[PDB]
Amino acid sequence: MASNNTASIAQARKLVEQLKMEANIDRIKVSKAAADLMAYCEAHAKEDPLLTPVPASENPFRE
Amino acid sequence: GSVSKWVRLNVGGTYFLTTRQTLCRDPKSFLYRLCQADPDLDSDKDETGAYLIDRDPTYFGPVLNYLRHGKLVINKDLAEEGVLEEAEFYNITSLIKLVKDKIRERDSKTSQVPVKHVYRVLQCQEEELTQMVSTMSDGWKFEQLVSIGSSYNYGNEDQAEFLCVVSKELHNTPYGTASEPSEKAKILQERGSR
Amino acid sequence: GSVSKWVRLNVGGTYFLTTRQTLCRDPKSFLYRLCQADPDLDSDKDETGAYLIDRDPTYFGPVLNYLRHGKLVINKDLAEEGVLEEAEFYNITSLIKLVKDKIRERDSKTSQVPVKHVYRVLQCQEEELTQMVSTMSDGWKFEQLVSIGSSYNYGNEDQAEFLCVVSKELHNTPYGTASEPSEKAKILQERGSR
Amino acid sequence: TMDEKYVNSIWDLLKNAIQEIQRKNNSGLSFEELYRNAYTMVLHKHGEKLYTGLREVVTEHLINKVREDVLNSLNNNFLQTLNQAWNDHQTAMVMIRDILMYMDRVYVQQNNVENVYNLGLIIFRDQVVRYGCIRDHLRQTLLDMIARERKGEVVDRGAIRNACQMLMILGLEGRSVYEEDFEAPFLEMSAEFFQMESQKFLAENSASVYIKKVEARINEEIERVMHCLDKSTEEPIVKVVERELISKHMKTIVEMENSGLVH
Amino acid sequence: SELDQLRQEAEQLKNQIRDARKACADATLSQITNNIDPVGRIQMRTRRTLRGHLAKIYAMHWGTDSRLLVSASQDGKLIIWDSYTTNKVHAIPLRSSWVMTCAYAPSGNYVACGGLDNICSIYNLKTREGNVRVSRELAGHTGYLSCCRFLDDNQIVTSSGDTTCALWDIETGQQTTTFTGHTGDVMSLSLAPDTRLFVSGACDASAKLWDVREGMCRQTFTGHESDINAICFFPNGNAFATGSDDATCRLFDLRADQELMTYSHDNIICGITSVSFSKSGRLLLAGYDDFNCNVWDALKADRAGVLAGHDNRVSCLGVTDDGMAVATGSWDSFLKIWN
């Protein structure tokens, strides 16, 4: 209804809920998350075709 | 007798028997006012008491069908216009809201004489051309193929070797062009245009 | 006893006399529910003891025909949609499929009055050109022809010299619109694609 | 859409008629009337709410009329009253589903939910039959009659068969409803009774008369099964006789007084 | 009225959220681990020239097979190419031009397309007749569609205008779940490899991660000073990069709930239009409104390299699902495969 600014309260409620779950969501340490990212990357940086060069007769662009 | 549950009715001298609630379905029909028992509307047969209504029985049928199941169905011989004005007499907005839409559909289809075909320029290799045409999407009609003098691979064996112009029929007159303001859409349109 | 071989139905004020077994043909129809004598059935036209139903006798025709002999029949004037909704009312599942299929076929064909056209690209030399053009396969409309500088045998009298695009009109629903892929059909299609 | 007014105006009399049928008044309303009423109610895409309304109205009718009366008649042919109540519900809900075949036909499949009769029988099984004071009263009295007949009494075999078939048909998913309330208590009481009988007769009588007695008891178990129980119950219970009487007491039968195997 | 209290509540919560991010605000180990040798300089080469397109190419997206890439052009034609042979496996004319998004089904059966038509058409490539026939048209997203992604061969998400990403079960063509978090209209999307949380970027600079199970916005992210152009979820389904009309890309994490790292340079000013990871995600490939795209080192945020090519802006990017190579949908009507 218009008396409640088109009942715009619901938008504020949804925003508040989003922030509530953001608060509830724990914040794993930034350095920790970065370390995890490098862990996965190096676990897969030794097979990335763009990082690890592909044999000239292996990439499906010279065969 | 003492109460009227299934009322017999005269529409242009024809018997129509139906329950009140079918007629009392919406609160706008002239028939709704008829259902209400009051001295003002006292016009019926002296034989069976069927109310005498000087309206068309043939165009009354679709209206009764709508009032029974909220959908107007008109046989493939009765003009939608005639039922339109018959309902206008029976004064049902929402129903009329649909009769006008049906009429507009008919008028647009009849106005499809300058049908708006959507044209596309698919481009294919001579090699891929056979499959492209064979595999050309159903619903689209081939219009023209054109070979061009290519510079790469001489004037043939080229991706731009063949330009297969195709088209598809669109009933845009019933559809209506879908143009509306979307700010980011306009920004994208202008950016791409230049 | 109270059971009568023939049962009279007052469809929208119209009497329909039919054998009960004709109506009892299926244990789903609303009419079949009428057939048995139960306390639930109370209202009947006292004029002849006809069960009074406020539904269209015009759309009761095809329904009674199918129920009597298991086949629906809709004239070229009565709306298929109206009989469809009437049958929905009387709750006969089997015939719904037939009505839906007929409605879909007609509406598709009308809306697809441009019906899915198949297109093919035959390739021939100038010499054979007249041979296959003259001997086009009955029902196939020639659509376009293009001259290509032949890479072999000079630029002419070679299969690559000319390309002839033809097509044929299909019937979308009348010939059926169903794709039924199989696992090995899928493997073959994948092989064909690449 | 903007159709709530007459939606309620039809719903109220629809539920009045539903109650009248559940109150067993079929002299003031006609089948096709409510049939079309339910149909049109569906046609406004109100199938879900009528599904729910049927659910709760029948729930109310059962709890405030059926369950209460069953609890009132615990000490007077309680099984007969429960069976009669179930039958009246079955009739009432039969013509109720006749009314609303449509949502039964179109809404149920559209929502992939239990059909209308599935709902009716589910609510009857839960709010009256599986209802604690009724479920357990039924189970215990069933075991009482069946044991008394086992003791050598003549009881209402038809009523016991009635109980078995209640549980059967009110079993929606299958025999599980039949299983838990009565079938499992019955099989357990039969097994213990057979255990005690086997021990008593092994101690008392000879091997040959023991075989005769256990065979006659197998026959009497068949008698019980086809006079007061369900056929699917036949195989478990006879197997129970085989185990309690015979399998557990195989070699002890070999030698007994002057009529053991060797004898 | 009570809106004052509501915005005060949102304000105290959000301030505490900032304070929690500050609580998690550590020395980002990534650039702290700058001693780790970077990716060096990658001399990257084009190997295919998919010049079959003639109009501006808006959306390009590899198929799951890493061989069939579907690219839509401005004129309204999808071209599914055989990447390794430069042969148009298909060329689908569109009922409406100005198609912004092309989405490939996980199985390769379906392709989704949408744009100013406001409807996501789904083309069922696999047909007995062999002719690509439209399967379902998803209409209802009043705002123009911007980027679509396939949850399944029956399930799809369509990032459209109208600040919505409503998920569709293709068969019924209904938006079973709706997403309404963004204030600006959504214009980018990216599915988690987990395929349970999808991150949406709108004109309001808000990168809202959504829970596909129920339709709630799992997390909100910010840091880009303008509309978010493209999102590439990290192969772990826990972090995702993001570009914008600014010359800055920012990498965020689900758990950290804040920007992990930034990617910008003074020399670059044109807005980022497409972001993409490598096989391992170490290389962050960013498509620029500038004539050419660049590759960043995700964990070291240095100038990994540039894909010097094209003679128009690159408007879409995508690496092979296997990370073998990468295509660059552009506006000079050429898709160039880089490897």
Side-chain angles (χ1 to χ4, degrees), chain E residues 222-235:
Chain E
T222 325
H224 265 102
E225 63 275 33
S226 53
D227 46 65
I228 283 172
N229 278 76
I231 322 187
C232 176
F233 223 131
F234 192 82

PDB file of all heavy atoms in Angstrom, chain E residues 222-235:
ATOM      1  N   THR E 222      30.983  -6.189  -3.388  1.00  0.00           N
ATOM      2  CA  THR E 222      31.114  -4.878  -3.997  1.00  0.00           C
ATOM      3  C   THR E 222      32.582  -4.484  -3.958  1.00  0.00           C
ATOM      4  O   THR E 222      33.425  -5.198  -3.412  1.00  0.00           O
ATOM      5  CB  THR E 222      30.240  -3.840  -3.285  1.00  0.00           C
ATOM      6  OG1 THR E 222      29.026  -4.458  -2.839  1.00  0.00           O
ATOM      7  CG2 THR E 222      29.898  -2.689  -4.219  1.00  0.00           C
ATOM      8  N   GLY E 223      32.881  -3.331  -4.544  1.00  0.00           N
ATOM      9  CA  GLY E 223      34.252  -2.881  -4.660  1.00  0.00           C
ATOM     10  C   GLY E 223      34.498  -2.301  -6.031  1.00  0.00           C
ATOM     11  O   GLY E 223      35.389  -1.469  -6.219  1.00  0.00           O
ATOM     12  N   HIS E 224      33.708  -2.747  -7.002  1.00  0.00           N
ATOM     13  CA  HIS E 224      33.713  -2.130  -8.318  1.00  0.00           C
ATOM     14  C   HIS E 224      32.845  -0.884  -8.278  1.00  0.00           C
ATOM     15  O   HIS E 224      31.699  -0.927  -7.822  1.00  0.00           O
ATOM     16  CB  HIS E 224      33.211  -3.110  -9.374  1.00  0.00           C
ATOM     17  CG  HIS E 224      34.310  -3.848 -10.071  1.00  0.00           C
ATOM     18  ND1 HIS E 224      34.640  -5.151  -9.767  1.00  0.00           N
ATOM     19  CD2 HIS E 224      35.166  -3.461 -11.045  1.00  0.00           C
ATOM     20  CE1 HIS E 224      35.646  -5.536 -10.530  1.00  0.00           C
ATOM     21  NE2 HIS E 224      35.984  -4.530 -11.315  1.00  0.00           N
ATOM     22  N   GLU E 225      33.398   0.225  -8.747  1.00  0.00           N
ATOM     23  CA  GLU E 225      32.750   1.522  -8.629  1.00  0.00           C
ATOM     24  C   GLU E 225      31.693   1.752  -9.694  1.00  0.00           C
ATOM     25  O   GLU E 225      31.317   2.904  -9.926  1.00  0.00           O
ATOM     26  CB  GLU E 225      33.793   2.641  -8.694  1.00  0.00           C
ATOM     27  CG  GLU E 225      34.557   2.722 -10.011  1.00  0.00           C
ATOM     28  CD  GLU E 225      35.755   1.797 -10.052  1.00  0.00           C
ATOM     29  OE1 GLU E 225      35.687   0.709  -9.441  1.00  0.00           O
ATOM     30  OE2 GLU E 225      36.761   2.155 -10.697  1.00  0.00           O
ATOM     31  N   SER E 226      31.214   0.709 -10.352  1.00  0.00           N
ATOM     32  CA  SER E 226      30.273   0.881 -11.451  1.00  0.00           C
ATOM     33  C   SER E 226      29.649  -0.473 -11.767  1.00  0.00           C
ATOM     34  O   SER E 226      29.853  -1.458 -11.047  1.00  0.00           O
ATOM     35  CB  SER E 226      30.973   1.490 -12.665  1.00  0.00           C
ATOM     36  OG  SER E 226      32.117   0.731 -13.018  1.00  0.00           O
ATOM     37  N   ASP E 227      28.891  -0.514 -12.858  1.00  0.00           N
ATOM     38  CA  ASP E 227      28.211  -1.733 -13.274  1.00  0.00           C
ATOM     39  C   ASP E 227      29.207  -2.865 -13.492  1.00  0.00           C
ATOM     40  O   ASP E 227      30.314  -2.656 -13.994  1.00  0.00           O
ATOM     41  CB  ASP E 227      27.442  -1.471 -14.564  1.00  0.00           C
ATOM     42  CG  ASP E 227      28.272  -0.729 -15.587  1.00  0.00           C
ATOM     43  OD1 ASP E 227      29.275  -1.299 -16.064  1.00  0.00           O
ATOM     44  OD2 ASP E 227      27.925   0.425 -15.910  1.00  0.00           O
ATOM     45  N   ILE E 228      28.798  -4.071 -13.117  1.00  0.00           N
ATOM     46  CA  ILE E 228      29.620  -5.263 -13.284  1.00  0.00           C
ATOM     47  C   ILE E 228      29.327  -5.857 -14.654  1.00  0.00           C
ATOM     48  O   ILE E 228      28.176  -6.173 -14.966  1.00  0.00           O
ATOM     49  CB  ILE E 228      29.349  -6.277 -12.164  1.00  0.00           C
ATOM     50  CG1 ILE E 228      30.061  -5.825 -10.884  1.00  0.00           C
ATOM     51  CG2 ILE E 228      29.793  -7.668 -12.592  1.00  0.00           C
ATOM     52  CD1 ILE E 228      29.719  -6.637  -9.647  1.00  0.00           C
ATOM     53  N   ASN E 229      30.374  -6.022 -15.466  1.00  0.00           N
ATOM     54  CA  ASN E 229      30.226  -6.412 -16.864  1.00  0.00           C
ATOM     55  C   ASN E 229      30.217  -7.923 -17.069  1.00  0.00           C
ATOM     56  O   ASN E 229      29.366  -8.445 -17.794  1.00  0.00           O
ATOM     57  CB  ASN E 229      31.344  -5.792 -17.702  1.00  0.00           C
ATOM     58  CG  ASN E 229      31.056  -4.361 -18.080  1.00  0.00           C
ATOM     59  OD1 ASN E 229      31.185  -3.452 -17.264  1.00  0.00           O
ATOM     60  ND2 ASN E 229      30.655  -4.152 -19.326  1.00  0.00           N
ATOM     61  N   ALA E 230      31.162  -8.635 -16.462  1.00  0.00           N
ATOM     62  CA  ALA E 230      31.287 -10.067 -16.683  1.00  0.00           C
ATOM     63  C   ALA E 230      31.844 -10.730 -15.435  1.00  0.00           C
ATOM     64  O   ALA E 230      32.673 -10.155 -14.726  1.00  0.00           O
ATOM     65  CB  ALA E 230      32.192 -10.368 -17.879  1.00  0.00           C
ATOM     66  N   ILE E 231      31.385 -11.950 -15.179  1.00  0.00           N
ATOM     67  CA  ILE E 231      31.827 -12.740 -14.037  1.00  0.00           C
ATOM     68  C   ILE E 231      32.283 -14.098 -14.543  1.00  0.00           C
ATOM     69  O   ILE E 231      31.594 -14.726 -15.352  1.00  0.00           O
ATOM     70  CB  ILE E 231      30.714 -12.912 -12.988  1.00  0.00           C
ATOM     71  CG1 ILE E 231      29.895 -11.632 -12.859  1.00  0.00           C
ATOM     72  CG2 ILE E 231      31.308 -13.279 -11.646  1.00  0.00           C
ATOM     73  CD1 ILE E 231      28.902 -11.678 -11.740  1.00  0.00           C
ATOM     74  N   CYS E 232      33.443 -14.547 -14.072  1.00  0.00           N
ATOM     75  CA  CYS E 232      33.939 -15.888 -14.353  1.00  0.00           C
ATOM     76  C   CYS E 232      34.191 -16.582 -13.024  1.00  0.00           C
ATOM     77  O   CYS E 232      35.162 -16.268 -12.328  1.00  0.00           O
ATOM     78  CB  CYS E 232      35.213 -15.850 -15.189  1.00  0.00           C
ATOM     79  SG  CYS E 232      35.928 -17.486 -15.466  1.00  0.00           S
ATOM     80  N   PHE E 233      33.323 -17.523 -12.674  1.00  0.00           N
ATOM     81  CA  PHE E 233      33.480 -18.254 -11.427  1.00  0.00           C
ATOM     82  C   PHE E 233      34.780 -19.048 -11.450  1.00  0.00           C
ATOM     83  O   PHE E 233      35.113 -19.681 -12.455  1.00  0.00           O
ATOM     84  CB  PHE E 233      32.288 -19.180 -11.215  1.00  0.00           C
ATOM     85  CG  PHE E 233      31.770 -19.183  -9.816  1.00  0.00           C
ATOM     86  CD1 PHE E 233      30.419 -19.021  -9.569  1.00  0.00           C
ATOM     87  CD2 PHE E 233      32.630 -19.326  -8.747  1.00  0.00           C
ATOM     88  CE1 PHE E 233      29.935 -19.014  -8.283  1.00  0.00           C
ATOM     89  CE2 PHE E 233      32.152 -19.324  -7.458  1.00  0.00           C
ATOM     90  CZ  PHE E 233      30.801 -19.167  -7.224  1.00  0.00           C
ATOM     91  N   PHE E 234      35.517 -19.013 -10.345  1.00  0.00           N
ATOM     92  CA  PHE E 234      36.772 -19.743 -10.279  1.00  0.00           C
ATOM     93  C   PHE E 234      36.497 -21.244 -10.374  1.00  0.00           C
ATOM     94  O   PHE E 234      35.477 -21.727  -9.871  1.00  0.00           O
ATOM     95  CB  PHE E 234      37.509 -19.425  -8.979  1.00  0.00           C
ATOM     96  CG  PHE E 234      38.931 -19.906  -8.953  1.00  0.00           C
ATOM     97  CD1 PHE E 234      39.934 -19.169  -9.554  1.00  0.00           C
ATOM     98  CD2 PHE E 234      39.264 -21.096  -8.338  1.00  0.00           C
ATOM     99  CE1 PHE E 234      41.240 -19.605  -9.537  1.00  0.00           C
ATOM    100  CE2 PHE E 234      40.567 -21.537  -8.318  1.00  0.00           C
ATOM    101  CZ  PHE E 234      41.558 -20.791  -8.919  1.00  0.00           C
ATOM    102  N   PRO E 235      37.385 -22.012 -11.013  1.00  0.00           N
ATOM    103  CA  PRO E 235      37.139 -23.456 -11.148  1.00  0.00           C
ATOM    104  C   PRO E 235      36.845 -24.170  -9.839  1.00  0.00           C
ATOM    105  O   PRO E 235      36.387 -25.318  -9.883  1.00  0.00           O
ATOM    106  CB  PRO E 235      38.434 -23.978 -11.790  1.00  0.00           C
ATOM    107  CG  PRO E 235      39.415 -22.839 -11.712  1.00  0.00           C
ATOM    108  CD  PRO E 235      38.576 -21.614 -11.780  1.00  0.00           C
TER     109      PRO E 235
END
